[PDB]
Amino acid sequence: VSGSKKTVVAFIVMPAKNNSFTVEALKGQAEVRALENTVHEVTTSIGKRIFDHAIRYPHNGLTTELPTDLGELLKSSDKVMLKRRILALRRPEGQLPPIVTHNMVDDANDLILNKIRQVQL
Amino acid sequence: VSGSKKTVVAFIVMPAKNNSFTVEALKGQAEVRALENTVHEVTTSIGKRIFDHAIRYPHNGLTTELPTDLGELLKSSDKVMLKRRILALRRPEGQLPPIVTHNMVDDANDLILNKIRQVQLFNSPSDRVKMIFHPEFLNANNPILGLDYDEFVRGCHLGVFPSYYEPWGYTPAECTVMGVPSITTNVSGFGSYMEDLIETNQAKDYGIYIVDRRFKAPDESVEQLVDYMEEFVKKTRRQRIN
Amino acid sequence: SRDLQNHLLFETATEVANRVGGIYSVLKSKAPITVAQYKDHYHLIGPLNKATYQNEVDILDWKKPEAFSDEMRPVQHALQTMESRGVHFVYGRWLIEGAPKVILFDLDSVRGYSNEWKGDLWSLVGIPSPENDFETNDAILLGYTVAWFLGEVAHLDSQHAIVAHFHEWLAGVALPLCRKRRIDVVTIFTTHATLLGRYLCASGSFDFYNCLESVDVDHEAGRFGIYHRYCIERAAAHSADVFTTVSQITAFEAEHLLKRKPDGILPNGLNVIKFQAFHEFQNLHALKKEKINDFVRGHFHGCFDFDLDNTLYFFIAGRYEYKNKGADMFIEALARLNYRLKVSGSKKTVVAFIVMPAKNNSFTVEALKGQAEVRALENTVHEVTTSIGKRIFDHAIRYPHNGLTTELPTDLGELLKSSDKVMLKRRILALRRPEGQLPPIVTHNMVDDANDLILNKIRQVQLFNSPSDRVKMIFHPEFLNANNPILGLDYDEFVRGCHLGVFPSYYEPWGYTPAECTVMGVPSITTNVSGFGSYMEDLIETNQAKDYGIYIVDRRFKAPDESVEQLVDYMEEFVKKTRRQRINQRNATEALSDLLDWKRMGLEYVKARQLALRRGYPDQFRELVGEELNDSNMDALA
Ligand SMILES: O=c1ccn([C@@H]2O[C@H](COP(=O)(O)O)[C@@H](O)[C@H]2O)c(=O)[nH]1
Numbered sequence A: 001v002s003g004s005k006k007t008v009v010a011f012i013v014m015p016a017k018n019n020s021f022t023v024e025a026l027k028g029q030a031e032v033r034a035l036e037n038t039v040h041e042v043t044t045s046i047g048k049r050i051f052d053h054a055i056r057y058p059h060n061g062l063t064t065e066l067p068t069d070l071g072e073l074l075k076s077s078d079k080v081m082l083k084r085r086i087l088a089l090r091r092p093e094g095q096l097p098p099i100v101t102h103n104m105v106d107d108a109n110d111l112i113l114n115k116i117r118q119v120q121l
Numbered sequence B: 001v002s003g004s005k006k007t008v009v010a011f012i013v014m015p016a017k018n019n020s021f022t023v024e025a026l027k028g029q030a031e032v033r034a035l036e037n038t039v040h041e042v043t044t045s046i047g048k049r050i051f052d053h054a055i056r057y058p059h060n061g062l063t064t065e066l067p068t069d070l071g072e073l074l075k076s077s078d079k080v081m082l083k084r085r086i087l088a089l090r091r092p093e094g095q096l097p098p099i100v101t102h103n104m105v106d107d108a109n110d111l112i113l114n115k116i117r118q119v120q121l122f123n124s125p126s127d128r129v130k131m132i133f134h135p136e137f138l139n140a141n142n143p144i145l146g147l148d149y150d151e152f153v154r155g156c157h158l159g160v161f162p163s164y165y166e167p168w169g170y171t172p173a174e175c176t177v178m179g180v181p182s183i184t185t186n187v188s189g190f191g192s193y194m195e196d197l198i199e200t201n202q203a204k205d206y207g208i209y210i211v212d213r214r215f216k217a218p219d220e221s222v223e224q225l226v227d228y229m230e231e232f233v234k235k236t237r238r239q240r241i242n
Numbered sequence C: 001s002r003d004l005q006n007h008l009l010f011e012t013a014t015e016v017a018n019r020v021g022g023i024y025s026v027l028k029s030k031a032p033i034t035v036a037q038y039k040d041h042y043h044l045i046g047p048l049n050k051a052t053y054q055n056e057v058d059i060l061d062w063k064k065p066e067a068f069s070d071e072m073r074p075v076q077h078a079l080q081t082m083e084s085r086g087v088h089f090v091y092g093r094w095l096i097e098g099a100p101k102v103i104l105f106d107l108d109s110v111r112g113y114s115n116e117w118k119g120d121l122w123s124l125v126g127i128p129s130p131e132n133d134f135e136t137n138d139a140i141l142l143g144y145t146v147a148w149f150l151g152e153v154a155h156l157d158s159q160h161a162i163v164a165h166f167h168e169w170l171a172g173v174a175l176p177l178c179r180k181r182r183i184d185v186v187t188i189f190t191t192h193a194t195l196l197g198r199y200l201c202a203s204g205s206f207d208f209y210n211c212l213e214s215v216d217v218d219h220e221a222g223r224f225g226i227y228h229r230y231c232i233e234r235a236a237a238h239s240a241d242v243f244t245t246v247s248q249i250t251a252f253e254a255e256h257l258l259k260r261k262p263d264g265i266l267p268n269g270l271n272v273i274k275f276q277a278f279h280e281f282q283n284l285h286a287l288k289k290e291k292i293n294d295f296v297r298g299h300f301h302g303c304f305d306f307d308l309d310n311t312l313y314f315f316i317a318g319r320y321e322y323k324n325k326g327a328d329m330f331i332e333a334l335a336r337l338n339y340r341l342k343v344s345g346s347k348k349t350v351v352a353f354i355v356m357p358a359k360n361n362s363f364t365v366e367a368l369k370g371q372a373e374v375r376a377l378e379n380t381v382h383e384v385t386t387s388i389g390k391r392i393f394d395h396a397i398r399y400p401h402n403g404l405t406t407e408l409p410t411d412l413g414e415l416l417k418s419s420d421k422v423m424l425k426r427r428i429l430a431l432r433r434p435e436g437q438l439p440p441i442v443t444h445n446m447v448d449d450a451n452d453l454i455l456n457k458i459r460q461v462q463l464f465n466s467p468s469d470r471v472k473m474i475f476h477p478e479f480l481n482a483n484n485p486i487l488g489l490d491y492d493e494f495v496r497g498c499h500l501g502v503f504p505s506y507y508e509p510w511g512y513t514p515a516e517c518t519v520m521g522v523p524s525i526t527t528n529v530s531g532f533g534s535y536m537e538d539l540i541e542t543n544q545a546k547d548y549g550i551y552i553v554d555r556r557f558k559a560p561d562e563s564v565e566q567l568v569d570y571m572e573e574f575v576k577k578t579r580r581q582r583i584n585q586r587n588a589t590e591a592l593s594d595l596l597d598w599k600r601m602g603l604e605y606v607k608a609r610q611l612a613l614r615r616g617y618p619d620q621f622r623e624l625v626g627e628e629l630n631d632s633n634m635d636a637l638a
């Protein structure tokens, strides 16, 4: 109502009978880890190209101290593997972030989970 | 003359009386390192930015999967330090990359330097052959070239040892054993021993070049040497590897 | 007067700028070396998939006088002649290396002429054509469109000889049409498999390689409800001036099931991408293998008693066809291989991957927890070593002062503090498996676990990955992909990281799988009833082949049990190799890669396009050489 730009993430940490983490929970962290790593390769490449530019100016027709055009730094190969990473993070149409990290032994009967459903968060 | 796009950095490693590395030599090294660390910092930041975009797409009005403007990635604070480091690499007008890495004791009468001066290989930009005299033996504790000699050797492309007097010649031997091609003379112990083992034309393909110092005047010899070096330069990566 | 040095070429298939089956990759990968020879003489014809062609075709205008050269003018007028009837067609370039000219006929713009053609076909050859089979309908439409189109081009070009090449029954209809209308074009048909073959091997009880010389083709074809389809395949085979298969083994099968000895073989080739340095593939091996090593660590968490420096990666990969890909023999053989290895007190280990898609519910929590727990160990260790580094450094910098008598520390206690240990001990406890739990034989929750052929077989032969088992089983019922959260390798990467491909196929007219393998310089086991295996068999003496990493198992003149025992021998032969031995073998394997490259297999295509011409115009051919040469083979002609 108030148009607030902030966000609250509320955790509830209370032991309930569960069958451990969901495949969604674990997959999601793995895909984020994969993104991070692919990003780390790409910045190593970019770094080697920034550096080359820096140590070479003003020779071989380099007019600017630094790169000016991203295409000097990000090549096709980099864009493809980053794009594949982004794709792995994509989640099925209209799927929302779960309200629970685990598989519950009695999900429908859980008090916490019933109350969250009832208030529609 | 032949418009070759290649470049040759010639190293000379032979101990001479010296006062250790020039300040310039050490400074150049610390300056490059300093740029590298700055580049590393900048790319870490750049990382956070690509990453952030990537995780957020296509929300908050991010319409392309990836950043497209450099400005999204490279902020101006990053530009300022990269520029500070680039300025530090700058060398005063006219000053050329030195032909030696140490302060020499009696520089003016050193034979190597004098010959280099004489032939005018001063490391000009238009010189397609550069020259570096390192008048001390290599060792991994060398602050500017942290390599042991054997390591340095593996790194090179060609060993060039045109001896007039060499009973054996460990030098091109340890060179060959590490799969680095070498130029030697038919008056060298090693040269003669090898020339005697292969057929002399074949020997070129096994990476043993043998300049004739017995049956040719010094000037015909020197010309043969230059034919060798030129032939090697014409090589492609694949051929060099083979 | 027509030109045999300077001739046109038309290659026709369902699977042009359009991926349906393996033929796509063949025509694609073959395009470079055809254009190299033909340029604008070469042309490809196929249907038109409207839903996709956009991402594949560089759409061109065929109207400007610029589009065609002076000798390639008739084609312009021939395409015009076809527009002279309102036949909608896309001209253009195929967005692939070599970018070749395609003609893609829109099918709906002839759909009306259906029954008239169906009937014409029925009284010309005798081919029934049920309306509910949408595919023969499309094959017919296409066939008539294409033959018509070749009728015009034969009228208008009078300089060059015309070669028409067809692939697979679906694009074979035009072939009887060309023979009966007596059109001035030499035709070639290639079959990449036989209809009757696939179907007779489907149940996989039928003793295919013996009983085929004894089957009633019409009877069987009718039994499987594919008489119409069959008639088309058979027509195309009979009508074609040259008839070819992709391999010897399929040639045999073609002769008895399509009633014509094929004139020769057109083995599929690959667009082998080379490296500047020869040994670069040895590097990639060790790099990729480290990624598989990473997976196996997590997979064996809290039950990891072997040495990865002494482990071999075996794989079978492909379509989930239990019996035709020989997954049965693979598993059986592995069970026996385990016995031999335990018995000899060997300390080597085999990790066997099965990569075949099956209905699954994605990865077990297990498979993901394990991978994350090893990661959590890795990260902790990296913290600790950093603390260690501090301590070593401080020692190394302050020696010999403050009573440091030794140059370096000598008691671990100086480097590893108790909080370091507590942490490490915690990561270790995370990796501990519950009492008596062995690591799983599969990395996914399966839709029908109890009925899955592969899992059942693994459980029947009792390969459960126990510590005493020297062979290990991992089933991965999904195709590999760099996006995989547990095995982040694409397929080709994975293959490179493995040691041995194992493809004991029963029904496989070509087998791209061991070829791809060979090209990546990975040794592979194949069979003599496999197109590839049969091709390789002729190229090399049998004992020599093992040294090039090609092993070929006899599935044609041996009882299945003998066939299995041979498989175990080869596998066991391979395990005994030392590293040095394997490295050289890979170098040898990598060296064969050339022979599978189009630069060499492309010749066979040449020999076949030639035999077509020497058959169409033997007079002109005879004189444009020196004499008339033997023409019962592509072999006897060149
Ligand atoms: O930086 C160097 C350069 C040369 N050498 C050694 O110098 C010898 C060259 O033989 P000589 O002809 O100088 O006696 C070789 O044994 C080679 O190992 C070094 O140890 N370090």
Ligand SMILES: O=c1ccn([C@@H]2O[C@H](COP(=O)(O)O)[C@@H](O)[C@H]2O)c(=O)[nH]1
Binding pocket: C317, C318, C319, C355, C478, C479, C480, C481, C491, C511, C512, C513, C516
């Ligand atoms: O994880 C995999 C496994 C196989 N393949 C491909 O599937 C084909 C399997 O051959 P086939 O069994 O369809 O003949 C091969 O060409 C291979 O490149 C993949 O793309 N990913």
Ligand SMILES: O=P(O)(O)OC[C@H]1O[C@H](O)[C@H](O)[C@@H](O)[C@@H]1O
Binding pocket: C282, C283, C285, C286, C289, C499, C579, C582, C583
């Ligand atoms: O995995 P293996 O068959 O034991 O071979 C592993 C070897 O493969 C490649 O050649 C690497 O370049 C070698 O450094 C490595 O030792």
